[PDB]
Amino acid sequence: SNLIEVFVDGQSVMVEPGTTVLQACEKVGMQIPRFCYHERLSVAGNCRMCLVEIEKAPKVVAACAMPVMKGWNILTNSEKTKKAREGVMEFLLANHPLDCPICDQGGECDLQDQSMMFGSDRSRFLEGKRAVEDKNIGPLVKTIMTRCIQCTRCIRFASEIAGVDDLGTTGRGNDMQVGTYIEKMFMSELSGNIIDICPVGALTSKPYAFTARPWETRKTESIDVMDAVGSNIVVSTRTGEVMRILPRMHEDINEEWISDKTRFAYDGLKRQRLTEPMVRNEKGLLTHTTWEDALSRVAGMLQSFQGNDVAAIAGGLVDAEALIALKDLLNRVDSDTLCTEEVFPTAGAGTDLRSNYLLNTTIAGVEEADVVLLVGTNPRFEAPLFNARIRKSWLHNDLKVALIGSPVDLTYRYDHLGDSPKILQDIASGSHPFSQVLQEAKKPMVILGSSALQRNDGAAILAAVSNIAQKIRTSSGVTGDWKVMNILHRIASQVAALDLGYKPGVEAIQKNPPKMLFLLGADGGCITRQDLPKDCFIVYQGHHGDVGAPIADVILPGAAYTEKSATYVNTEGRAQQTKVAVTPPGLAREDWKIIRALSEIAGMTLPYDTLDQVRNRLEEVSPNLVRYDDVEGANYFQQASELSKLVNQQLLADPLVPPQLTIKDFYMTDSISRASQTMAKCVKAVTE
Partner 1 sequence: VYDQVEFDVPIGSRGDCYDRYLCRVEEMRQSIRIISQCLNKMPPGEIKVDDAKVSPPKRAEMKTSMESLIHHFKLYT
Partner 2 sequence: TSVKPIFSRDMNEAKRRVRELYRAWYREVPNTVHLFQLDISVKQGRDKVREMFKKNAHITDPRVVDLLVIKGKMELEETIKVWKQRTHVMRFFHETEAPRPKDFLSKFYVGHDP
Partner 3 sequence: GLREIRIHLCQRSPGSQGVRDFIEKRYVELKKANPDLPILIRECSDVQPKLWARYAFGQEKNVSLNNFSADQVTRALENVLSS
Q: Does residue 107 interact with partner 1 by CB under 8 A?
A: yes
Taking the C-alpha atoms of residue 604 and residue 305, their distance in angstroms, rounded to an integer, is: 13
Q: Does residue 275 interact with partner 2 by CB under 8 A?
A: no
Q: Does residue 198 interact with K ion by CB under 5 A?
A: yes
3-state SS class at 65: coil
Taking the C-alpha atoms of residue 75 and residue 25, their distance in angstroms, rounded to an integer, is: 10
Q: Is 198 annotated as a binding residue?
A: yes
Angle (deg, nearest 10), helices 591-601 and 320-331: 20
> Which of these segments, 191-199, 287-295, 296-304, 375-383, binds K ion (CB under 5 A)?
191-199
Q: Does residue 252 interact with partner 3 by CB under 8 A?
A: no
Among 71, 64, 53, residue whose Cα is nearest residue 26 = 64
Q: Which does 96 bind (CB under 5 to 8 A by kind): ligand FES, K ion, partner 1, none?
A: partner 1
Angle (deg, nearest 10), helices 291-303 and 591-601: 60
Q: Is 96 annotated as a binding residue?
A: yes
Binding residue for partner 2, selected from 16, 600, 642, 654, defined by CB under 8 A: 600
Q: Does residue 650 interact with partner 1 by CB under 8 A?
A: no
Binding-site size for partner 3 (CB under 8 A) equals 29
Q: Does residue 201 interact with partner 1 by CB under 8 A?
A: no
Taking a C-beta distance cutoff of 8 angstroms, is the pair 167, 180 a contact?
yes
Taking a C-beta distance cutoff of 8 angstroms, is the pair 590, 544 a contact?
no
Taking the C-alpha atoms of residue 234 and residue 223, their distance in angstroms, rounded to an integer, is: 8
> Which of these segments, 195-203, 533-541, 563-571, 602-610, binds K ion (CB under 5 A)?
195-203
Helix H segments across 548-657? Answer: 591-601, 611-621, 637-644
Restricting to residues 215-274, which ones interact with partner 1 according to CB under 8 A?
Answer: 215
Give the chain's end-to-end CA distance (angstroms, integer): 60
Q: Is 25 annotated as a binding residue?
A: no
Report the nearest approach of partner 3 to the CB of residue 209 (Å). 46
Taking a C-beta distance cutoff of 8 angstroms, is the pair 37, 51 a contact?
no
Give the strands of the sheet with 400-404, arranged side by side: 415-418, 400-404, 371-375, 444-449, 485-488
Taking the C-alpha atoms of residue 14 and residue 584, their distance in angstroms, rounded to an integer, is: 52
Report the nearest approach of partner 3 to the CB of residue 630 (Å). 8
Q: Which does 454 bind (CB under 5 to 8 A by kind): partner 3, partner 1, ligand FES, none?
A: none
3-state SS class at 615: helix
Q: Does residue 93 interact with partner 1 by CB under 8 A?
A: yes
Q: Does residue 440 interact with partner 2 by CB under 8 A?
A: no
Angle at 319 between CA 574 and CA 627, to 5 degrees: 30
Q: Is 682 annotated as a binding residue?
A: no
Taking a C-beta distance cutoff of 8 angstroms, is the pair 608, 620 a contact?
no
Beta strands in 602-644 (DSSP E): none
Restricting to residues 492-511, which ones interact with partner 3 according to CB under 8 A?
Answer: 499, 501
> Which of these segments, 148-156, 208-216, 558-566, 621-629, binds partner 3 (CB under 8 A)?
621-629
What's the Cα-to-Cα distance from 425 to each of 463, 465, 644, rounded to whole Å?
10, 9, 15
Report the nearest approach of K ion to the CB of residue 348 (Å). 50
Report the nearest approach of partner 3 to the CB of residue 221 (Å). 24
Q: Which residues are annotated as a binding site for [4Fe-4S] cluster?
A: 96, 100, 103, 109, 148, 151, 154, 198
Contact footprint for partner 3 (CB under 8 A) = 328, 331-334, 336, 349, 351-354, 499, 501, 620-624, 627, 630, 632-636, 639, 642-643, 646
Contact footprint for partner 1 (CB under 8 A) = 93-94, 96-98, 100-101, 106-107, 111-113, 115-116, 119-123, 125, 213, 215
Q: Which residues are annotated as a binding site for [2Fe-2S] cluster?
A: 36, 47, 50, 64
